[PDB]
Amino acid sequence: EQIAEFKEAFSLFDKDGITTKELGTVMRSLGQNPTEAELQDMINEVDAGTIDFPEFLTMMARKMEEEIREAFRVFDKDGNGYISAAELRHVMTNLGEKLTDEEVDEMIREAGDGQVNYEEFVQMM
Amino acid sequence: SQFLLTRLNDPKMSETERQSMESERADRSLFVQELLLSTLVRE
Amino acid sequence: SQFLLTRLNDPKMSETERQSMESERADRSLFVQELLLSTLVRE
Amino acid sequence: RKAAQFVDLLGYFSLKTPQTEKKLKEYSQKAVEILRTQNHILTNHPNSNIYNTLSGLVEFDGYYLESDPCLVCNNPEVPFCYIKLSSIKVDTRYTTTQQVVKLIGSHTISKVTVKIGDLKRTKMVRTINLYYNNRTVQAIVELKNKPARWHKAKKVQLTPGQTEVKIDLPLPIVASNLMIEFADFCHKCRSINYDEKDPFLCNACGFCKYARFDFMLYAKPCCAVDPIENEEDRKKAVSNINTLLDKADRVYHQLMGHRPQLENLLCKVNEAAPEKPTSASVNRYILQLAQEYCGDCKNSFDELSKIIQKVFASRKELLEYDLQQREAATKSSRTSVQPTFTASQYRALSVLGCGHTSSTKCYGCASAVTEHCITLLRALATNPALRHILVSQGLIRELFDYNLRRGAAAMREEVRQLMCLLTRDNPEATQQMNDLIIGKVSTALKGHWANPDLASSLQYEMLLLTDSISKE
Amino acid sequence: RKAAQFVDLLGYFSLKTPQTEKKLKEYSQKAVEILRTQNHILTNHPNSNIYNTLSGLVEFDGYYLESDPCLVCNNPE
Amino acid sequence: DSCWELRLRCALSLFLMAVNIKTPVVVENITLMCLRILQKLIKPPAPTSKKNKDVPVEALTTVKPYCNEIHAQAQLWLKRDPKASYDAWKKCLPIRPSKSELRHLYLTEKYVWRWKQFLSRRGKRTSPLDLKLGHNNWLRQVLFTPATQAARQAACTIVEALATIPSRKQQVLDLLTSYLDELSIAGECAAEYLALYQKLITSAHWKVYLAARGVLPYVGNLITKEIARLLALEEATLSTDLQQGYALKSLTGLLSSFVEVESIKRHFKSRLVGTVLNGYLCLRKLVVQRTKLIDETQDMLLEMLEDMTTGTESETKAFMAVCIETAKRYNLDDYRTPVFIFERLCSIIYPEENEEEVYKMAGVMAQCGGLECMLNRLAGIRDFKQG
């Protein structure tokens, strides 16, 4: 059922019968609301300038635990198994968002020892 | 004059009616004068 | 032109001052746009 | 507005006939609902603000800035009058014993008085004949073909020596060209008619040695179109209709254009800014607004109305021709049985019911409806039980709220009279009205020290209170 | 109206020359009192309603409906 | 000045306070002024500092808004809530390559959004709103307001300004298309709205996105309803409407513009053909209250039908089947529409020149059983002169 809608959308967006330039717009047309970073990452994943209907189907399939573990590992930048609050501040600065050090402390406090274990991260998700 | 409804106002009064209206008007005038005078009394 | 108080109107701004004012105006416009959009959200 | 007599008759019959309480209540509810709906419609008219503001400043004839032409409000009743025949002369042709004339435009003649001056007994027309044609022709000589270019109206035998004869058409005839012949019986241009030795008038000059004839008609000008008889006539009519539609669109765009300038001028006037410089003593903005509205808007409205009337006439004629052709085709079909129509069905299907309404959002039409409603309510108030029922319906609040101030001075006086009558002896109603008046007055007086306009906007209430006190 | 130049000069002197906070407060009180009194007088003027209403309609040259002729107003240069 | 926040609060309070009032005086006197002030605020004056003298207005932003969330709490700011400061909004917004770096950034952004949501749900972090607008709002009343065309223009400008981020433009075009239904109600006074839509629909990609929403069916249904209303009116009375045809012509033009997309034509040309044919027939029937705008709409519809009537052999067969079905819809006593119907059909079957392979279309007609309908129509003929 969904495959039919995807094929119809691919045909519609296919100008000459698709380019990655409107690929994000295709997802927006399908009802999915993507983030610009997510779109850029998907484009990097796929276009190793035009994709095939099977390629778009595969991309949508990845859109419809391992990622959680990878994110947790990324959080432990020092890899000490403990995600440092200072590491969290460095990550947020990399993200460009500005937040209070007290805000980071409160967030970690909301996260016994207050040290985010892998179990703690999983429970957060 | 073709408008029939125009002739609606048909008031009339007896001579006794006029006299009674005069007496009522006099009583009303007296009451009004008394009330107005009360409005100017010394506090 | 004899009125000295008339010639009092005399503002000045630096190029950096103009740039900062433009940036503040842009930020204010963005805030206004966001607030106005919030005024039409679905309930 | 044409339904005044209907309103009068309805009021008289309703008041005279006794009726059930439920019937009275239903009638009251219906009337009140009609009045409330009309008031609500008027209160939100798109042009309401502009028209209301303009009303107080310039003496305005009509609301000449409506979108769709209010046809009922647009069709005045011009009366026929005696006008000289020579006045409308456009094309002139003269023959041995007949004269062909074209009018400046179509008109509906009722009777024509023809006087015979400089009469000579040698040749006296024992009779005359008339013919009329409402078909547009270019040249007087072009209509020399007699039968097709004439439709005889009446032949009247004139006694010898009679000068002024008033040939009266049994019904008014609408036409564009006429041919009048001295049916029974050069000196000016020296055009010796070798053909006619002694004609009634010169075949070229119309120099009439027998006599001279002057004519006039108790007529009113009429707008119409020549009858459409051929399919070529149908095509010509379609083309004319399209052209008229284009011209009307241009005129309507032009007329609607004046609106923004009028709005800007109204804004400037509302400022009421004092300025220094009695024919020109008025505010320059006021004079400019008067010139714009009274001068331009009125002229544009008139032109658009004329165009719309012509377009309606053409559309009616085309519909008539098409319906006649369709009916003829149906009649030719033997299988097709002729449908006899009941009188109501015939009237409904007839083209008679086509032009008897104003515009839907016609501010003037709504105002007329409101005025008629006010008159009807004033009448219906006479029955004391009806008065109590209406007060139960709570008309007083609506009357004070909406209809109290708007409208003409006579309308305002009538509304005040009706309001006074409604509280003739109802103590509760009198208390309610007095409470409303006192509340408005006190609310105004609270900001009295700050708003001169507040003091300026209490005249109507005070007049109403004075009138109420006036009726013992 | 002849004190326009005087007013401009007084304003320039007051703005340019520094003064004590008490002096500023006193000048402010004086000006405010003058303005309030003038406004109150204008608001309660006898012909105030008539002149005000007439203002918005026709181009008025002067208030030609005063009882006592104002010598300052009635002596054009 | 520094009273920017307070003055803005007062102004917005006034604007939202009487936005629902419909009286012409109130709209003219209060709503117009507030709208003009807001318009001046939203679009600032052009930059003057030489550094950004030519820079885009959107470029000078010191922050970047949330991609799919609006962090502003309008009710709070109106309530002068302490947490609803403009500085608060500034603090909440973010400031303004290896493939593994990109993947890490995306994962970090997703995890940060999730963590912020969890902190909001469990703790006291505020909840930013989501980009979903209601079908009933001040914009709907304001845009098609019949009081003043200047107010409509100002609202159009404000709305055009409101659509800067593509994510915003998505919901913006959604709401605009949703509001399109009222076009017939205000045939003339809504001209600005159309002007806005056409202006915003200039992007071909946005055009395809709107097409994906299935707007074509809504447009067709609206066109059919308008044609039906017009036919009923022309059949009913003989009144003259100077504005007759504005909405119809506008809708026809919009439909043609949407159809200009070649890929869209390849997509759903067949689905719309029948509506076009029925409309062309009905317009050809319209003879009483015929407007110049109506004539132009009819011409545009005929041109669109002809353009759509050019494709593959299967496409020709589908067009023939559609014609046969429409003729089945035509009444037997009717003797006008079948003329043009069969004329176009014949022109298509054997191409009129300006073994019977050129007549292979006839075999398609037999397949459609149109020959039976042809015999039935032939039976319907009774009067030789009349037909």
Distance CA D18, CA D126 (A): 66
Q: Measured between CA atoms, how close is D9 to chain B, in angstroms? A: 8
Do C15 and F103 contact (CB within 8 A), yes or no?
Answer: no
Match 């609050």 to its residue by tokens.
Answer: A85
- List helix spans (H) across E1-77: 4-16, 21-43, 48-57
Q: Which of D225, D223, D228 is nearest to D324 (CA)?
A: D228
Tell if the CB–CB gap between C26 and F139 is shorter than 8 Å: no
Is position A52 annotated in a ligand binding site? no
C15/F89 Cβ within 8 A: no
The answer to whether the Cβ–Cβ distance between D452 and E59 falls below 8 Å is no
Please list every residue in chain F whose beta carbon sits closer than 8 Å to the beta carbon of residue D69: 240
Q: Would the CB atoms of C2 and E8 count as touching at under 8 Å?
A: yes
Q: Which residue do the tokens 């607008």 mark?
A: F133
Nearest partner of D177 among D97, D109, D82, judged by Cα? D109
Measured between beta carbons, the chain A residues lying within 8 angstroms of F267 are 11-12
Taking the C-alpha atoms of residue C41 and residue F73, their distance in angstroms, rounded to an integer, is 11
Give E9's contacts in chain C (Cβ within 8 Å): 4
Contact D274 E57 (CB under 8 A): no
Q: Annotated binding residue at A76?
A: yes
Please give the Cα distance from F258 to F276 (Å, whole number).
14
Q: Is A115 annotated as a binding residue?
A: yes
Shortest Cα–Cα distance, A119 to chain F (Å): 15
Task: Tell me which chain F residues have a C-beta less than 8 angstroms from the C-beta of D44.
Answer: 22-24
Paired residues of D179 in beta bridges: D100, D131
F41: contact with C, CB 8 A cutoff: yes
F284/F299 Cα distance (integer angstroms): 10
Cβ neighbours of F145 in D, within 8 Å? none
| Chain D residues near residue F191 by CB distance under 8 angstroms | none
- Outline where DSSP puts E strands in chain F: 69-70, 129-130
CB F49 within 8 A of CB C19: yes
Interchain contact B8–D (C-beta under 8 A):
yes
E62: phi then psi, degrees, rounded to nearest 5: -140, 160
Question: Which residue of B5, B21, B25 is in closest CB contact with D379?
Answer: B5
In angstroms, what separates the C-alpha of C9 from chain F's closest C-alpha?
17
Q: Which residues pair with F95 in a beta bridge?
A: F63
Task: Pull the structure tokens for residue D389.
Answer: 């029922």
Q: Provide DSSP, F274-313.
A: HHHHHHHHHHHH--SS--HHHHHHHHHHHHHHHHHS---H
Would the CB atoms of C5 and E12 count as touching at under 8 Å?
yes
Cβ contact, residue pair C4, E12, below 8 Å: yes
User: Do the Cβ atoms of F4 and C41 come within 8 Å?
Assistant: no
Amino acid at C43: E
- For this entry, resolution in Å reads 3.4
**Across-strand partners of E58?**
D282
Q: What one-character-per-residue DSSP string does F101-137 give? A: HHHHHHHHHHHHHHHHHHHHHHSS----EES-B-SSS
Contact predicate D107/D84, CB 8 Å: no
Binding-site residues on chain D for chain E (CB distance < 8 A): 272, 274-278, 281-284, 286, 449, 452, 455-456
Q: Which residues contact D132 (CB under 8 A, 6 or more apart)?
A: D150, D151, D153, D173, D175, D177, D178, D179
SS3 F84: helix
Whether chain D lies against chain E with 3 or more Cβ pairs closer than 8 A is yes
Q: Is A20 one of the annotated binding-site residues?
A: no
Measure the CA–CA gap between A9 and A31, rounded to whole angstroms: 11
Neighbour count for residue F168 (Cβ, 10 Å): 19
Residues β-bridged to residue F63: F95
Kindly report the nearest CA distance between residue E62 and chain D, in angstroms: 8
Closest-CA residue to D266 (of D63, D62, D54): D54
Closest by CA position to E63, among listed E77, E50, E44 = E50
Nearest to C34 among F12, F62, F65 (CB): F65
Where b means 16+ CB within 10 Å and e means fewer, A82-111 reads ebbbebbeebbeeeebebeeeeeebbbeeb
Burial code (b: 16+ CB inside 10 Å, e: under 16) for D232-266 equals ebeeebeeebeebbeebbebbeebbebeeebbebb
Half-sphere exposure of D169 (CA within 13 A, CB side): 18
Helices (H) and strands (E) in chain D, counts: 15, 7
Cβ–Cβ < 8 Å for D57, D262: no
How far apart CA B32 and CA D58 sit, in angstroms, is 44
CA terminus-to-terminus distance, chain F: 81
Tokens of F139: 């914009």
Query: In this structure, are residues F110 and A71 in contact, taking their beta carbons and an 8 Å threshold?
Result: yes
Q: How far away is chain C from the Cα of F114, in angstroms, using its nearest Cα? A: 22
Neighbours of D459 (CB within 10 A): 10
Approach to solving:
cryo-EM
Residue type, F110: K
Interface contacts (C, E; CB < 8 Å): 13
Chain F positions in Cβ-Cβ contact with residue D43 (cut-off 8 Å): 23
Phi, psi of A79 (to 5 degrees): 65, 15
Q: Could you give the angle at the alpha carbon of F386 between the alpha carbons of F385 and F387, nearest 5°?
A: 95
Q: Which two tokens stand for residue D83?
A: 């006008």
Structure letter (DSSP) for residue F50: G
Residue D30 near residue D390 (C-beta atoms within 8 A): no
Does the annotation flag A101 for ligand binding? no
Neighbours of F303 (CB within 10 A): 12
Kindly report the nearest CA distance between residue E6 and chain D, in angstroms. Answer: 26
DSSP C43: -
Residues for chain A: how many in total? 125
Give the contacts of F236 (CB within 8 A, at least 6 positions apart).
none
Q: Which residues pair with D177 in a beta bridge?
A: D102, D133
Interface residue D329 vs chain F (CB under 8 A):
yes
From A13's Cα to the closest Cα of chain F, the distance in A is 7
Report CA torsion sign: F295, F297, F300, F306.
Answer: negative
- The answer to whether residues D219 and D107 touch, using CB atoms and an 8 Å cutoff, is yes
From F174, F37, F133, select the one nearest C32 (Cα to Cα).
F37
- Element housing D220 (H / E): strand D212-221
Locate C31 and state its tokens. Answer: 């805030």
Taking an 8 Å Cβ-Cβ cutoff, which residues of chain E contact chain C?
4-5, 8-9, 11-12, 15
Q: Closest chain F residue to C15 measured between Cα atoms?
A: F49
Phi/psi of residue D110, nearest 5 degrees: -110, -55
Q: How far apart are CA D322 and CA D234, in angstroms?
A: 9
What token pair was written down for D179? 């041919």
CB within 8 Å of D418: residues ≥ 6 apart: D374, D377, D378, D381, D399
Mutate to test the interface with F, among D315, D361, D365 (most CBs of F within 10 A): D315
Closest by Cα among F232, F227, F231 to F247: F227
Provide CB contacts within 8 A for E28, sequence distance 6+: none
**Which is it for the CA torsion F220, F225, F229, F234, positive or negative?**
positive
Among D218, D292, D214, D226, which residue's Cα sits nearest to residue D255? D292
D304 Cα to chain B: minimum distance (Å): 35
Tell me whether B9 touches chain D (CB under 8 Å): no
CA triple E38-E40-E43, angle to 5 deg: 105
Q: Which residues on chain D are in Cβ contact (under 8 Å) with E61?
A: 276-277
Which residue type occupies E51?
Answer: Y
Cβ contacts (< 8 Å) between E17 and chain C: which residues?
none
User: What phi and psi, each to the nearest 5 degrees, are found at residue D101?
Assistant: -135, 145
Residue of C nearest to F137 (CA): C40
**Gaps in chain E after residue (C–N beyond 2.5 Å):** none
Point out the residue among D274, D284, D455 whose CB comes nearest to the CB of E60: D274
> How far D44 CA sits from the closest chain E CA (Å)?
28
Distance CA F365, CA F346 (A): 11
For residue A54, give the 3-state DSSP assignment: helix
What's the alpha-carbon Rg for chain B, to the nearest Å?
19
Q: Do at least 3 CB pairs under 8 Å connect F with B?
A: no
Report how far Cα D98 is from the mean position of its chain's Cα atoms: 38
Has A120 been labeled as part of a binding site?
yes
**C-beta contacts of A74-77 below 8 A and 24+ residues apart:** A74/F104, A74/F107, A74/F108, A74/F111, A75/A116, A75/A121, A75/F111
The pair of structure tokens assigned to D307 is: 């165009």
Distance CA F141, CA F129 (A): 23
Q: ∠ CA(F92), CA(F98), CA(F102), 5° rounding?
A: 35
Q: Which two tokens stand for residue D154?
A: 């009446």
Of F279, F318, F321, F286, which is closest to residue F300 (Cα–Cα)?
F279
| Chain C (12-41) residues lying within 8 Å, Cβ to Cβ, of chain E | none
Question: Residue F242 and residue D252: Cβ atoms within 8 Å?
Answer: yes
Q: Token pair of A22, please?
A: 């409107």
Compute the distance between CA of residue A21 and CA of residue F205 in angstroms, rounded to an integer: 10
User: In angstroms, rounded to a whole number, what is the distance separating the alpha carbons of residues E13 and E10?
Assistant: 5
- HSE-up of residue D60 (Cα within 13 Å, Cβ side): 23
Amino acid type, F307: D
The closest CB to that of F133, out of C23, C31, C40, belongs to: C40
Distance (Å, rounded) from C-alpha B40 to C-alpha D74?
Answer: 62
C-alpha neighbours within 13 Å on the C-beta side of residue D30: 8
Virtual torsion, Cα F265, F270, F274, F277, nearest 10 deg: 50
Q: Rg for chain D (alpha carbons), in Å?
A: 31
Q: Is there a contact between D169 and D110 (Cβ–Cβ < 8 Å)?
A: yes
Residue D312, token pair as written in the block: 């309606």
Round to whole Å and give the CA distance between F147 and F153: 12
Which of F71, F108, F75 lies closest to F90, judged by CA? F71
Tell if the CB–CB gap between E59 and D281 is shorter than 8 Å.
yes
Q: Is the dihedral of CA D193, D195, D200, D204 positive or negative?
A: negative
